[PDB]
């Protein structure tokens, strides 16, 4: 908590023109609303919950999406961009590319809150994907994303978008479990990589994820040694625990929070605050 | 490439 905040501040003040990556998981959204899926109940996924699934990651699977494709109809209506607010953290991304100290942030959400946020496309990766388009499960072929939100609005959902090539479904081009990840995520990657082998020393920031889905969780293990890893989550995970590097700094903080303590101790709250109330 | 998944290495 504090002594790991401090270092995080002590390294950009020694480093000011340094950049930053993040990396960033299911954690960062659960202030605005949206549970990590697998738990459902009260809020956001209240009508998944009724007629559900027979695994928990059955909603993102593609195998189950092809048996029934009414359980991620309805949970992506509560999904779109525009339902939720950012959180205080979204917006610290948004205060780091204002300072010029954002290199990319990675994102494993598809609410696209870094985006709605203020973050400029350049710097965010969207590793599994987003509603931007739709395409065919069969054919890949891509398609207009009115052609799945217009059906979300209907009551009830029935007679699913199918592709007017081949007739299977489509949907949103969000990654799915079992389905391969956009290019621009593993290109992208490779350059930062190949940046991050390149005296001011940048810095990998890794909040809130559980660090369980590949290929994304791969990507802290690939940070070189020689650059400090640092772990915001409400337990230390993946390459953390596995692996720990003499120099990894963990921080058990809520996200919001964090990015409260590291606001100020860099001194920013002022164009923090700004950036909040607008 | 990079297939997703809860499984891996
Ligand atoms: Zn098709």
């Given at each position: 908590t504090?002594?790991?905040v401090?270092?995080?501040?002590?390294?950009?003040?020694?480093?000011?023109?340094?950049?930053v990556?993040?990396?960033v998981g299911a954690?960062?959204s659960?202030?605005?609303?949206?549970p990590?899926?697998?738990?459902?109940?009260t809020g956001?996924?209240?009508?998944?919950?009724?007629?559900?699934?027979?695994?928990?990651?059955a909603?993102?699977?593609?195998?189950?999406?092809?048996?029934?494709?009414?359980?991620?109809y309805?949970?992506a209506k509560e999904?779109?961009?525009?339902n939720?607010?950012p959180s205080?953290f979204?917006?610290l991304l948004?205060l780091f590319?204002?300072?010029?100290?954002?290199?990319?942030?990675?994102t494993?959400?598809?609410?696209?809150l870094?985006?709605?946020?203020?973050?400029?496309?350049?710097?965010?990766?969207e590793?599994?994907?987003?509603?931007?388009?739709?395409?065919?499960?069969?054919?890949?072929k891509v398609?207009?994303?009115?052609?799945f939100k217009?059906k979300?609005?209907?009551?009830?959902?029935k007679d699913?978008?199918?592709?007017?090539?081949c007739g299977?479904?489509?949907?949103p081009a969000?990654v799915f479990?079992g389905?391969?990840?956009?290019?621009?995520?593993?290109?992208?990657?490779?350059?930062?990589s190949?940046?991050?082998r390149?005296?001011?020393q940048?810095?990998?920031?890794?909040?809130?994820?559980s660090?369980?889905?590949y290929?994304?969780?791969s990507?802290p293990?690939?940070?070189?040694?020689?650059?400090?890893?640092?772990l915001?989550?409400?337990?230390?995970?993946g390459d953390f625990k596995?692996?720990?590097?003499?120099?990894?700094?963990?921080?058990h903080?809520?996200?919001?929070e964090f990015?409260?303590?590291?606001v100020?101790?860099?001194?920013?709250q002022?164009?923090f605050?700004?950036?909040?109330?607008? | 490439?990079?297939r997703?998944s809860?499984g891996?290495?």
């Open positions: 504090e002594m790991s401090r270092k995080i501040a002590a390294h950009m003040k020694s480093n000011p023109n340094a950049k990556i993040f990396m954690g960062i659960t202030s605005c609303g949206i990590d899926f697998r738990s459902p109940g956001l996924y209240h009508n998944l919950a009724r007629l559900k699934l027979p695994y928990p990651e909603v993102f699977d593609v195998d189950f999406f092809q048996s029934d494709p009414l359980p991620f309805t949970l999904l779109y961009p525009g939720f607010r205080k979204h917006y948004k590319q204002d300072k010029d100290v954002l290199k990319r942030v990675y494993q959400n598809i609410d696209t870094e985006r709605q946020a203020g973050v400029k496309d350049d710097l965010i990766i590793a599994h994907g987003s509603f931007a388009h739709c395409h065919c499960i069969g054919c890949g398609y207009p994303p009115q052609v217009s979300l609005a209907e009551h009830p959902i699913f978008v199918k592709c007017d090539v299977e479904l489509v949907k969000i479990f389905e391969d990840l956009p290019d621009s995520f593993s290109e992208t990657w490779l350059n930062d190949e940046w991050l390149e005296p001011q940048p810095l990998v920031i890794v909040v809130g994820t660090l369980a889905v290929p994304f969780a990507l293990e690939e940070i070189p040694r020689k650059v400090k890893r640092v915001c989550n409400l337990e230390t995970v596995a692996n720990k590097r003499p120099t990894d700094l963990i921080v903080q809520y996200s919001d990015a409260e303590q590291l100020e101790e860099l001194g920013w002022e164009d605050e700004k950036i909040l109330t607008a | 490439t990079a997703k809860t891996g290495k």
